[PDB]
């Protein structure tokens, strides 16, 4: 039994974005690799730069295989995102640990039945303040959106003194808050 890699519920794809002004936004999105096992996840995570060490303007994106990390994808166009906004000091304190936790919420299917509503997650490294978001497939499903946001907020360890917002991509305003 000790020779079988541990298969994830889904295959995931990790994307990288670099703000090169000579290309279109979409041409700046690059697929890095895919994995579908625990071991291959850690092999890739241990290979790549921490989000706190990326140049401002880059993104990582982890999405279920077959969902591109853009609003235009069939599974994102009716959806939205749970947004965490980081201040500039939280790049040192919280960015990397929040991001790795977000990645585990995804590959570990941490939102019960509603993990089917998850499309992926995105971290934006920005001089103006970093951002992490979980993208879900349908803003009109209030049960799935709300329960993902409650669990997400607790897995991040945010206190109720903090509130986080859900924004639909079509607007991208707050449609849900937990």
Is 71 part of any known ligand binding site? yes
Is 57 part of any known ligand binding site? no
* DSSP codes, 98-127: HHHHHHHHHHTTTTGGGGGGEEEEEEE--T
Question: What's the rounded Cα separation, in Å, for the pair 30 and 53?
Answer: 18
Is 173 part of any known ligand binding site? no
**Number of domains the chain contains:** 1
Contact 140, 54 (CB under 8 A): no
Strand partners, 84: 132
Residue found under tokens 């989000």: 51
Is 42 part of any known ligand binding site? no
- Resolution in Å equals 1.9
Task: Show the domain range for 123.
Answer: 1-178
Evaluated on CA atoms 66, 156, 127, 136, the torsion sign reads positive
Is 99 part of any known ligand binding site? no
- Give residues with Cβ within 8 angstroms of 17, minimum separation 6: 28, 29, 30, 58, 59, 60, 61
Residue 69 sits in a domain of what CATH number?
3.30.760.10
Pairing of strands 176-177, 165-168: antiparallel
CA 129, 133, 137 angle in degrees (round to 5)?
150
- Give residues with Cβ within 8 angstroms of 26, minimum separation 6: 70
Tell me how long the chain is.
178
- Which tokens go with 32? 């890095």
Contact 144, 136 (CB under 8 A): yes
Is 15 part of any known ligand binding site? no
Method: X-ray
Per residue in 36-57, is it b (16+ CB within 10 Å) or e — as a string? beeebbeebeeeeeebbebeee
Question: What's the rounded Cα separation, in Å, for the pair 174 and 60?
Answer: 23
Is 78 part of any known ligand binding site? no
Contact 62, 103 (CB under 8 A): yes
- Side-chain half-sphere CA neighbours of 97 within 13 A: 8
Phi (first) and psi of residue 29, to 5 degrees: -80, 125
- With residue 175 as reference, give the H or E element that holds it: none
Is 150 part of any known ligand binding site? no
Distance between first and last Cα of the chain: 42
Question: What's the rounded Cα separation, in Å, for the pair 148 and 135?
Answer: 10
Residue 23 to residues 18, 19, 26, 64, Cα–Cα distance (Å): 10, 8, 8, 25
Query: Beta strands of the chain (E only): which ranges?
Result: 7-17, 29-37, 59-64, 80-85, 118-124, 131-136, 165-168, 176-177
């Amino acid at each position: 039994e000790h020779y079988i890699k541990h298969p994830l519920q889904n295959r995931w794809a990790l994307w990288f974005f670099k703000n090169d002004k000579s290309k279109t936004w979409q041409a700046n999105l690059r697929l890095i690799s895919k994995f579908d096992t625990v071991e291959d996840f850690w092999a890739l995570y241990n290979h790549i730069q921490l989000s706190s060490n990326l140049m401002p303007g880059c993104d990582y994106s982890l999405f279920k295989d077959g969902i591109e990390p853009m609003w235009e994808d069939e599974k994102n166009k009716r959806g939205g995102r749970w947004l965490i906004t980081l201040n500039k000091q939280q790049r040192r304190s919280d960015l990397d640990r929040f991001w790795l936790e977000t990645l585990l919420c995804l590959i570990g299917e941490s939102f019960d039945d509603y993990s089917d509503d998850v499309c992926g997650a995105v971290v934006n490294v920005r001089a103006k303040g970093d951002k992490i978001a979980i993208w879900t497939t349908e803003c009109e499903n209030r049960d799935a959106v709300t329960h993902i946001g409650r669990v997400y907020k607790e897995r991040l360890g945010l206190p109720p003194k903090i509130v986080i917002g859900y924004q639909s991509h079509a607007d991208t305003k707050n449609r849900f808050v937990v």
